[PDB]
Amino acid sequence: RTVARDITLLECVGKGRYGEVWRGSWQGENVAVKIFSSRDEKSWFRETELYNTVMLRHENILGFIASDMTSRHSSTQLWLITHYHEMGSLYDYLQLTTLDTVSCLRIVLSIASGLAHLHIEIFGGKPAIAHRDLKSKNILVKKNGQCCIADLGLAVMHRVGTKRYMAPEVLDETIQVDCFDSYKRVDIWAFGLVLWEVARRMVSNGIVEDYKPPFYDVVPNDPSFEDMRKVVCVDQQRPNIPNRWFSDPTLTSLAKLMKECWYQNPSARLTALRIKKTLTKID
Ligand SMILES: COc1cc(-c2cncc(-c3ccc(C4CCN(C)CC4)cc3)c2C)cc(OC)c1OC
Ligand SMILES: COc1cc(-c2cncc(-c3ccc(C4CCN(C)CC4)cc3)c2C)cc(OC)c1OC
Ligand SMILES: COc1cc(-c2cncc(-c3ccc(C4CCN(C)CC4)cc3)c2C)cc(OC)c1OC
């Protein structure tokens, strides 16, 4: 039979230290092609190893299509092919777009759904998985208003995380590295920062906050590990909840939820399943 393996790379939609992501075309259908730098080969190997262990299939997990390794003259080329989400990342989306109560809840419940699916062990099934780099750039927006979680290059089954999103126990090196639940609790911290980023863009009583990344007001751009440790661990700062949220029942409930993702004590934080249940009772 014919194995049509050609992908037409049409436009670059992301470029970083990781490498590049392209919109591509296979048999008339859009795909996303992540081309890895030499620098970040181990991210391709880890995501490939995970998908070779468990073929994750969930509406709120970026859809896997293929892992490709091609021999070149002097190098190895590593591609990850996935579903293509033309609306781009949540980070991208929140820059110009504002949300209402329905769209805000749909976004955050879809993220919680994807995260709970990663975290849960299913017997007969899937191993439990922690993401370890959850942030708004690693979440894609779908046309139906739900999101999907991307980038399992740091995932662990039962490179470091983006420093801005690191939990206190990562920054102070107290994380119980032999305990899988520790890595879940690091994801929940990061989830709470994403929830704050999204909630800011939800309009209430004619008011919205501008898009800002977590800790924009207390660390530099490209904060150092030390910058983050002093804010999060030493001073125990947390993102600001604006007064205007306390006039809106949805943002009042979301403020309480994000507080319960940011406890210094990792074992006090809510689980992804408890976050879903709380979100299904809002509105
Ligand atoms: C190797 O590499 C690439 C392959 C492909 C590709 C292209 N046409 C058809 C296929 C195909 C799928 C599955 C079967 C099955 C049929 C049932 N039978 C019992 C077992 C075998 C056969 C054929 C594939 C896998 C695309 C690629 O790009 C997206 C590839 O490169 C990453
Ligand atoms: C990787 O991704 C894509 C793959 C394909 C694709 C191409 N040829 C053949 C197949 C296939 C056929 C038949 C089986 C069999 C397996 C065992 N049993 C006998 C029942 C079913 C499996 C696989 C597929 C899935 C199409 C795609 O899109 C239209 C893909 O997505 C980009
Ligand atoms: C986070 O990580 C990965 C993401 C993706 C991915 C999947 N769908 C769509 C995208 C995308 C498309 C388009 C835009 C822009 C361009 C046009 N307009 C001006 C605004 C929107 C941005 C983003 C991406 C980047 C694939 C990945 O792997 C193949 C990723 O890595 C795991």
Curated annotation (Swiss-Prot):
This is Activin receptor type-1. Its EC number is 2.7.11.30. The chain holds residues 202 to 499 of 509 of the full protein. The keyword Kinase applies. Belongs to the protein kinase superfamily. TKL Ser/Thr protein kinase family. TGFB receptor subfamily. The lineage of its organism: Eukaryota, Metazoa, Chordata, Craniata, Vertebrata. GO terms for cellular component: activin receptor complex; apical part of cell; BMP receptor complex; plasma membrane. Keywords: ATP-binding, Disease variant, Glycoprotein, Kinase, Magnesium, Manganese, Membrane, Metal-binding, Nucleotide-binding, Phosphoprotein, Receptor, Serine/threonine-protein kinase, Signal, Transferase, Transmembrane, Transmembrane helix. It is linked to Fibrodysplasia ossificans progressiva: A rare autosomal dominant connective tissue disorder resulting in skeletal malformations and progressive extraskeletal ossification. Heterotopic ossification begins in childhood and can be induced by trauma or may occur without warning. Bone formation is episodic and progressive, leading to a debilitating ankylosis of all major joints of the axial and appendicular skeleton, rendering movement impossible. The keyword Transferase applies. Expressed in normal parenchymal cells, endothelial cells, fibroblasts and tumor-derived epithelial cells. The active site is at D133. Interacts with FKBP1A. Interacts with FCHO1. Interacts with CLU. Interacts with type II receptors AMHR2 and ACVR2A. Interacts with BMP7. Interacts with GDF2/BMP9. Interacts with BMP6 (when glycosylated); the interaction may induce HAMP expression. Interacts with TSC22D1/TSC-22. ATP binds at V13, G14, K15, G16, R17, Y18, G19, E20, V21, K34. GO terms for biological process: activin receptor signaling pathway; acute inflammatory response; atrial septum primum morphogenesis; atrioventricular valve morphogenesis; BMP signaling pathway; branching involved in blood vessel morphogenesis; cardiac muscle cell fate commitment; cell differentiation.
